[PDB]
A paper describes a structure:
Pyruvate kinase muscle isoform 2 (PKM2) is a crucial regulatory enzyme of aerobic glycolysis and catalyzes the penultimate step of glycolysis, producing pyruvate and adenosine triphosphate (ATP) from phosphoenolpyruvate (PEP) and adenosine diphosphate (ADP). In contrast to the isozyme PKM1, which localizes to the inner retina and has constitutively high activity, PKM2 is under complex regulation and is principally expressed in photoreceptors in the retina. Tetrameric PKM2 is the high catalytic activity state associated with ATP production and catabolism. On the other hand, its non-tetrameric or dimer/monomer state has low catalytic activity; is associated with anabolism; and is favored by high nutrient availability, certain growth factor signaling, and a multitude of post-translational modifications.
Considering the comparable potency and target activation achieved with compound 2, the crystal structure of PKM2 in complex with compound 2 was sought to gain insight into its binding mode and assess if changes to the core scaffold resulted in fundamental differences in the target–ligand interactions. The asymmetric unit contained one monomer. The monomer within the asymmetric unit contained a single compound 2 molecule, and each tetrameric PKM2 contained two compound 2 molecules with the small-molecule activator spanning the A-A′ interface, as previously observed in the co-crystal structure of PKM2 and ML-265. The PKM2:compound 2 monomer also co-purified with an oxalate molecule, which is an analog of PEP, in the active site. The binding pocket for compound 2 on PKM2 is distinct from that of the active site and the endogenous activator fructose-1,6-bisphosphate, which is in proximity to the C-C’ interface. As a two-fold axis exists at the A-A′ interface, the binding pocket for compound 2 contains equivalent residues from both protomers that make up this dimer, and the small-molecule activator can alternate between orientations based on the two-fold symmetry axis. In the binding pocket, the pyridazinoindolone core of compound 2 was observed to be sandwiched between two Phe26 side chains with the aniline moiety forming an edge-to-face π-π interaction with a Phe26 side chain. This aniline moiety also forms a direct hydrogen bond to the carbonyl group of Asp354 and a water-mediated hydrogen bond network with the sidechain of Asn318 and carbonyl group of Asp354. The sulfoxide of compound 2 forms a direct hydrogen bond with the main chain nitrogen of Tyr390. Additionally, the carbonyl group of the pyridazinoindolone core is involved in a water-mediated hydrogen bond network with the carbonyl group of Leu353 and the side chain of Asp354.
Author numbering:
A (entry chain A), B (entry chain A), C (entry chain A): 13 to 531
Write the structure that this text describes.
Amino acid sequence: IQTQQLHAAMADTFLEHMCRLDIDSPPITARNTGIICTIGPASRSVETLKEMIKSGMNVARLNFSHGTHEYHAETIKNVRTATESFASDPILYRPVAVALDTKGPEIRTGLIKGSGTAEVELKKGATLKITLDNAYMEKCDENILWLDYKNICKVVEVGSKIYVDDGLISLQVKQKGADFLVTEVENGGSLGSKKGVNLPGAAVDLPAVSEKDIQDLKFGVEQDVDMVFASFIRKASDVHEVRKVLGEKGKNIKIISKIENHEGVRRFDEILEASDGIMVARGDLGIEIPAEKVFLAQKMMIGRCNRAGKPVICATQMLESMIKKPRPTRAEGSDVANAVLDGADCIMLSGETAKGDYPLEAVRMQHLIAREAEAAIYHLQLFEELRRLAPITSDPTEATAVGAVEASFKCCSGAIIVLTKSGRSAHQVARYRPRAPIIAVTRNPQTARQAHLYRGIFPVLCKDPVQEAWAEDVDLRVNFAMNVGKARGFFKKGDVVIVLTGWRPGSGFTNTMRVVPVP
Amino acid sequence: IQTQQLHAAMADTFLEHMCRLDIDSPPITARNTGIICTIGPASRSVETLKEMIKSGMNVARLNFSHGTHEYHAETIKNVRTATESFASDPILYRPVAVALDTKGPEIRTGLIKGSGTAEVELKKGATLKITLDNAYMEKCDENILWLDYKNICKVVEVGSKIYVDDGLISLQVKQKGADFLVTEVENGGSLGSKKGVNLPGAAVDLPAVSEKDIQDLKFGVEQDVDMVFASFIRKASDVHEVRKVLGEKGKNIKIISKIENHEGVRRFDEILEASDGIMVARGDLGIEIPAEKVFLAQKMMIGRCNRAGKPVICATQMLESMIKKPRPTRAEGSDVANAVLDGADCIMLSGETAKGDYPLEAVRMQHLIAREAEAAIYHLQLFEELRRLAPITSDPTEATAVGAVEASFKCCSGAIIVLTKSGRSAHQVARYRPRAPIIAVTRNPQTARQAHLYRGIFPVLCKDPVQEAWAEDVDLRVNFAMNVGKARGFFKKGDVVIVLTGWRPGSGFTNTMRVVPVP
Amino acid sequence: IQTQQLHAAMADTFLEHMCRLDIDSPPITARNTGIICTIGPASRSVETLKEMIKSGMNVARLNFSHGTHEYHAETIKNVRTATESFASDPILYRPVAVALDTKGPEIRTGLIKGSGTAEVELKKGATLKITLDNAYMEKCDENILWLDYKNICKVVEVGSKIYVDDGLISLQVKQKGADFLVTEVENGGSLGSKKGVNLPGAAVDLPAVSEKDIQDLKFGVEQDVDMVFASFIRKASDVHEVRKVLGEKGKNIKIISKIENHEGVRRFDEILEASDGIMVARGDLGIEIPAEKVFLAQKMMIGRCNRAGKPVICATQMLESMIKKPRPTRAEGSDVANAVLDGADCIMLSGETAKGDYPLEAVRMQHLIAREAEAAIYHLQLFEELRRLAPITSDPTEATAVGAVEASFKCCSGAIIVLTKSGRSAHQVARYRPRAPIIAVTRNPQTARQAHLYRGIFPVLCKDPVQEAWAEDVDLRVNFAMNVGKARGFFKKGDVVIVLTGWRPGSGFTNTMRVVPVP
Ligand SMILES: Cn1c2cc([S@@](C)=O)ccc2c2cnn(Cc3cccc(N)c3)c(=O)c21
Ligand SMILES: Cn1c2cc([S@@](C)=O)ccc2c2cnn(Cc3cccc(N)c3)c(=O)c21
Ligand SMILES: O=C([O-])C(=O)[O-]
Ligand SMILES: O=C([O-])C(=O)[O-]
Ligand SMILES: O=C([O-])C(=O)[O-]
Ligand SMILES: [Mg+2]
Ligand SMILES: [Mg+2]
Ligand SMILES: [Mg+2]
Ligand code: NA
Ligand code: NA
Ligand code: NA
């Protein structure tokens, strides 16, 4: 009871659970929450990517808001070289997924004075004209700002606020022309080139999937990516458009809808139904809606995804100060812990890994915090609530999964080992949020990579030949999981583990739960 | 959701659960609570015993407060003839247990005027001398009453109350002699022969196990009884004395301690620890302690037995009016239902089946009420509480049992089929109080009879030869349970059931839970 | 914590609450559940009625199924003489209500051989003709039975069951004529004169309010009765008919609807809405619907009445054996306790007080059991649930009432003293089920009598002249309650009590809650 916050785990009230949280109670070795890292100049070499995997990276995110297809194909090649450098030891091999994050309907400014490093000073109170004349697309300065959204004058009015560069620069429309705006700088600062622009409260009519997004999604299918993070999803038809673009060839690629505007929050239920998962894309979200309301949208979305059993990712500025510093702020440590306590399946790093000075430290910090927070979850009430908000069904696979999770709590198992082809049987267990790590054994490499979207799934890729007798092949895969758990420090000989298997080969036959000692 | 009170089952508060109880919601066919019937002149013929089994009798109770060993051996012979008359169809055969109920430390009066039918009228206010002179042991009348407790004057004082015949006649000691008492009749009535006497508040020093109880317990071992109901257990050493008398030859006979005095209630925890189960023996209990407090002692004992996972029986006057009438009173219908809602594993009939005019109707009524009450249990909160008050242990059999019960709730299974040698694996499931009936398949006849002590266990005695391959023998026994469930109307082809089995032959290896459709 | 089951009261689970119930934990002196006694030959003398009030009788029930208006007027006169014999001490005076119970749509048989004591033996298997020919209304025998329901042949068919005398005699229709039936005796026995007949499953078309019921309701208004118990209410329009008959002169008389048939249970919600309260009339109910389902209907109705804040009475055969015996059966003790644990505001005695040999003992037993059961209620969960199923409203009187109940739990108050004119402010407190007795001080005699319908209200009738300053008159009434509580052993000097008063004279102004020490 001294380890894994087990004294707090036994409290019969949430208040007593909080009172019992102990900084001297060590967590288990397993870290359940997936870590997604944005790849960029600080992290795209093979040598660095090997250290990133060792530090805890589970998913490499390619941001298609920047870079060419040649640049992204080279990043994907380096991710695969680094990942496969560990393949010779299947017991320790960690699958690594590749995620394509779309540019989507962004608004960007032009180049300052023709240079990429040049910057201009916008002073509070000063006038700033917004133009759509392409003659100034590379001649932006303190007096005139070009932007690429050709219909901007139709969606804003006098008094409208315009935010630039992560909402740090604020402008207010004072005069509106047919194809230009005259604004006053409210919050000033230094303006650089190609910065993001947000129009809160405006009904921006850019397509959810542009011609560029189509080329990028099709490139993703050609490159065999595991998932797409679709930017600025506002409604179910936007998700259906992405699904249509991926088509038959991309039918197994997971679609994660990014919620980053008010409409996405309002139409969340229909977006969730149509998507494979959700990303709480807090950067844009916190500019589109008041920054003080983002925690409400985050908790609502994580709650509804946990209720639906679909993966949810918490993203953006989680450890922001680590772009320049080797340790995070206290707010950043708290943010990562609370995202895990809320129920996030995955947490993400953006600039911290893409361009920062301490990418490895940032990955290691998310690993350390997530593991501490996982032990601090009040599983007593969470499991009780997940069970009650779960329908009574004649699905034998769901009854086996909940039976396995209940049994894992009763014996404080070292793991729940699950044999899975498509990943579904392992996802069914993860939906009940066990404390024990879920070792999902599969022979399907894509299933192993995609498993990282779910809290607690440790996918392991079995490379052994298939045994002719089904029972012997099941035993071989279960033995492979026992070896993985022992090697990774999850459990040891004599400990008790839960094992889930099916009665015949193929998908959808998981019906057997065994409680067995580790050999 | 219309059947088995499933609408009330889904309520998230106990008050809403009560509001949703529906008289038009039909229960399932299975009736989980064991029915124990006292055998006597109204029910000891083979023909009547066959009808008693068909009506729902699971255990035949032999009351050793009356009758000779020859009389009881003939009753046991008739119970076995009636039970085995159904053995030719194992699918429908219902095992029937034999219970020996000890006389224990009773106090009895003598014979009125030398006759067994003669009665005298005791009027309120009249004087009545209690004598210990054996010259009057067959000459009791309205002036002098002989009783067999030779030390009565040492344990009572002036003012002491003495109750006679189910506490219906009340006397108060007015004068005390060296070996006689002079009393005043408080509550009068007609006094018959050999009536029971209770001395509430007196420290009666009769032995827990008398020379007669020793002969009777040894006779029970010779007759192969399944369980003993030990009268007036006051402390753990009394249980150890019964255990010593049964000895090595009777080591598998279950000891149920009867709690019927204040000391038994005060020292309940130590009695429960030493016993195999408990009987709330309300007749004597309600005379030894104030009648208005019996429900407190009943609820406390049923609560502590459910918490400990030991069988508890509710007994005496449950359907008392049915000794003379074909329908029970409203209080009697309520009593049986509330004993089941409290958590009683078994309910009992005494005079209703032993000497009454409607034994079959009384058995049928307990069956009907118990089945209605079983559907009305608030399993949502009961299961949650049983799980929380259950220790985390490395016992794989307990983790499998709780996993099976959780899975049975998730798919509203038709049954939990359990293969068991000693009965333990089935008892482990019953302790979690599933709504689904537990079909316990065994080849051990004593295990099949003793299983009736636990709520929800339907023991079935497999008579098929053992198959040489363990897997084929397991499959044969599971198929036998599928046939029993279909034949008895518990489930049908295509329904989902939970199946619990072990990994090797023998006791203590239950570790596999399967969710399978009925063939 | 040793008294009033306070150790069990602190348990955080219902199972641990049961485990902690202690037969040695004394209850408080106050007994909260009202006791309603049916008056008859055993209890209608002034001398006996004085002993009945001293024993615990709170409401005298007049059964209009028997007796003339002259007989009932004399009973009411004797009840009032006995009640007012204690009026000279207002501190100890216990108000006593008068309830009129209607005959309603009953079916009765004729006289056997012209005598009231004559009986015939109906043997199982024998034929019995049911006639409607008035020539045989006083010539009933083993061959022919007259009954007063002229349309019986239109509502029954071949195979229909007919029950006679508390459902003890059962007949099955074998042949149906135009105005007679030929039946076979299923359950035989001795048939007397003018016995009640039930036709389960038949749509009996007798009026809810007959010409006799109209005369009886109008007589009730003339006699100043406090409440009416309306027999066989099946729908809301039946309640509206009773309300119309009582009219303007009887507008303050409470209407308690008796639920005693399947239609009454099915249309319960509309009946409850239209009524002032409900009676679970178990005698007829347990013949109209299967006896094994009555506990479901009882728990459903008590649950819905507690949820609605309307009084509910549990009635019939609660202590039935005490008609002939001085002590009840164990099922009867359990029935009374479980009715109180279920949430019944009142419990009732019928034959036990009307014609039995031990009326005073029966009243005393209900008092003793109810007080023990009141301490055993799990107030921790009950109060939590009542609060959650209570709407947020701008009614200041409801906020004051719930605040007072919360404060009473916090300081384990000796009482909640409430000043009330119409009774409403005291009813508002009782609806939250505090453990503390509610001392309702009123100057309205009818309000004092009607208060007995609600659990926990101890009405006290203030006879002091009104003080000219409102604050001094409030203080006088609060001091009167302090004197009542001290005299009746509810609390003593220095204890803490809760006091609820209003800001101005009149009804509907209760808004002040004070926590004060007893002077
Ligand atoms: C954050 N949190 C929870 C978290 C969980 S699992 C998701 O960790 C389970 C129940 C709960 C709960 C229940 N009640 N409250 C309210 C509350 C109760 C007592 C103390 C505090 N600080 C809050 C919560 O905040 C709360
Ligand atoms: C009888 N009973 C229970 C029975 C069960 S299972 C044993 O049927 C589970 C919880 C409970 C519970 C919880 N709270 N209360 C108190 C309560 C709450 C709401 C309404 C009422 N009438 C009582 C019970 O009496 C109670
Ligand atoms: O797109 C994102 O991830 C964001 O805006 O945070
Ligand atoms: O012995 C018993 O069963 C009793 O006293 O009820
Ligand atoms: O009318 C009644 O009270 C009954 O039937 O129980
Ligand atoms: Mg964004
Ligand atoms: Mg006894
Ligand atoms: Mg009636
Ligand atoms: Na468990
Ligand atoms: Na479940
Ligand atoms: Na409080």
